[PDB]
């Protein structure tokens, strides 16, 4: 049965949401999002209204991608879908999509920036990121854009992963957090990349939680690459060969060879086990980085690691990515996914 919708204007656009959602207030950065009190579940929720979802093929495909991703993610440490609705009564008038998720009070960026983090806080926070990433990667999904701002956290330090990378050139330019957590292979388009790019991001985050400082705050791509290589050393012959970009390979070979630095001398006073894990994450060769599944079993997480409570994901069919469809087809697929949504228990 259809709920009653009511409307209000929240900064230049009309929100039409079901009555269960009250006290809407904008929170901007994450898209077009409102905090809301959900009266049926008693939860504080985030309601995102999609922005012109079917105005182009790329937009319509994006909207479907986003809904597909969110409907599949059911894990404590990954943002999931509480609800999805449109005020539209049929396909013909279907033109707006609204998404409802948990609203966690803060992001990791405000945590590291405002509070001192004990080594035990670091254990728990990274543990949770890895636990959710094992789940994410097990579905063959790559986040691609892991940074402190898309790690939501509550009062109890419980964490969910948000905003799967699904950026323009300018946004990646200069002295910007948008690029500081990016694996060098994506940053510079070295090769066809995979899910361990997400592990490099975790390395940078973990480092920053331990020291309270960005690990590689490059002023631009090249400066950042230098910051990276000073720490991990320049590529060996084996890696140079795996860079499929001739042009990128040729550039990296112009650099004075440097060895990998001693991580105990960079992360002074840190847990030796934390140092070890960092050395295994911040490996230049992605083939050799530690996987999230492998990381969870590392000694650093002895306290939180529970092999029976680190679930993988159901199969995720993303063959739609290969498909070229018409706006109307992408829109009909999105509609079918809206109409068949069943709330969680
Ligand atoms: C895909 C995908 N990845 N993330 C989303 C998504 C979709 C809808 C929403 C409302 C959100 C969302 C975005 C941010 C938060 C959130 O809790 N941010 C915390 C910052 C304010 C202190 C919660 C949820 C995220 O979708």
- 55: tokens are 């105005």
What is the CATH classification number for the domain harbouring 256?
1.10.510.10
CB of 152 within 6 A of ligand 1: the answer is yes
Instruction: Confirm whether 121 is domain-assigned.
Output: yes
211 and 120 in a common domain: yes
154 and 120 in a common domain: yes
| Angstrom distance (rounded) from CA 345 to CA 189 | 42
Last residue of a domain, one of 105, 120, 153: 105
133 and 92 in a common domain: no
111 and 93 in a common domain: no
Structure resolution in Å? 2.5
For residues 146 and 198, the answer to whether their CB atoms sit within 8 Å is yes
189 and 50 in a common domain: no
121 and 44 in a common domain: no
Active-site choice (38, 107, 163, 198): 163
| Angstrom distance (rounded) from CA 202 to CA 207 | 8
308 and 208 in a common domain: yes
170 and 126 in a common domain: yes
- 70: tokens are 């969110």
Give the technique used to solve this structure.
Answer: X-ray
User: Domain containing 32: what range?
Assistant: 15-105
293 and 207 in a common domain: yes
Distance 33 CA to ligand 1 centre (A): 8
100 and 175 in a common domain: no
CB of 101 within 6 A of ligand 1: the answer is yes
| Angstrom distance (rounded) from CA 31 to CA 340 | 24
How far is C-alpha 64 from the geometric centre of its chain's CA atoms? 18
Q: Binding-site residues, please?
A: 27-33, 48
What is the CATH classification number for the domain harbouring 89?
3.30.200.20
Distance 77 CA to ligand 1 centre (A): 13
For residues 288 and 213, the answer to whether their CB atoms sit within 8 Å is no
Residue identified by tokens 């105005």 is 55
163 is catalytic: yes
Distance 329 CA to ligand 1 centre (A): 27
Question: SS3 helix, strand, coil % of the chain, rounded to 5?
Answer: 40, 15, 45
In the chain, how many domains are there? 2
Q: What does the angle CA 194 – CA 195 – CA 200 come to, to the nearest 5 degrees?
A: 105
291 and 170 in a common domain: yes
For residues 28 and 163, the answer to whether their CB atoms sit within 8 Å is no
Instruction: Give, as one character, the DSSP assignment of residue 212.
Output: S
285 and 298 in a common domain: yes
């Amino acid at each position: 049965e259809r709920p009653t919708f009511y409307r209000q204007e929240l900064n230049k656009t009309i929100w039409e949401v079901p009555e269960r959602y009250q006290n809407l207030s904008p929170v901007g950065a994450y898209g077009s999002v409102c905090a809301a009190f959900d009266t049926k579940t008693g939860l504080r929720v985030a309601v995102k209204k999609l922005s012109r979802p079917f105005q182009s093929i790329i937009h319509a495909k994006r909207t479907y991608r986003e809904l597909r991703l969110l409907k599949h993610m059911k894990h404590e440490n990954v943002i999931g879908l509480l609800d999805v609705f449109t005020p539209a009564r049929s396909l013909e008038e279907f033109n707006d999509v609204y998404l409802v998720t948990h609203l966690m009070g803060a992001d990791l960026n405000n945590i590291v920036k405002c509070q001192k983090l004990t080594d035990d806080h670091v254990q728990f926070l990274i543990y949770q990121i890895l636990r959710g990433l094992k789940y994410i990667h097990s579905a063959d999904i790559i986040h691609r854009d892991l940074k402190p701002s898309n790690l939501a956290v509550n009062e109890d330090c419980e964490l969910k992963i948000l905003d799967f990378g699904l950026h323009t050139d300018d946004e990646m330019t200069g002295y910007v957090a948008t690029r500081w957590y990016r694996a060098p292979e994506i940053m510079l388009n070295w090769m066809h990349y995979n899910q361990t790019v997400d592990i490099w991001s975790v390395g940078c985050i973990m480092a920053e939680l331990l020291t309270g400082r960005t690990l590689f705050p490059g002023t631009d791509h090249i400066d950042q690459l230098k910051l990276i290589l000073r720490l991990v050393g320049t590529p060996g012959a084996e890696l140079l060969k795996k860079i499929s970009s001739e042009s990128a390979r040729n550039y990296i070979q112009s650099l004075t060879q440097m060895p990998k630095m001693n991580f105990a001398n960079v992360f002074i006073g840190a847990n030796p086990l934390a140092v070890d894990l960092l050395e295994k994450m911040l490996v230049l060769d992605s083939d050799k980085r530690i996987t999230a599944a492998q990381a969870l079993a590392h000694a650093y997480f002895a306290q939180y690691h529970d092999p029976d409570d680190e679930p993988v994901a159901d199969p995720y069919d993303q063959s739609f990515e290969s498909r070229d469809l018409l706006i109307d087809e992408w829109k009909s697929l999105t509609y079918d996914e809206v109409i068949s949504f069943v709330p969680p228990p």
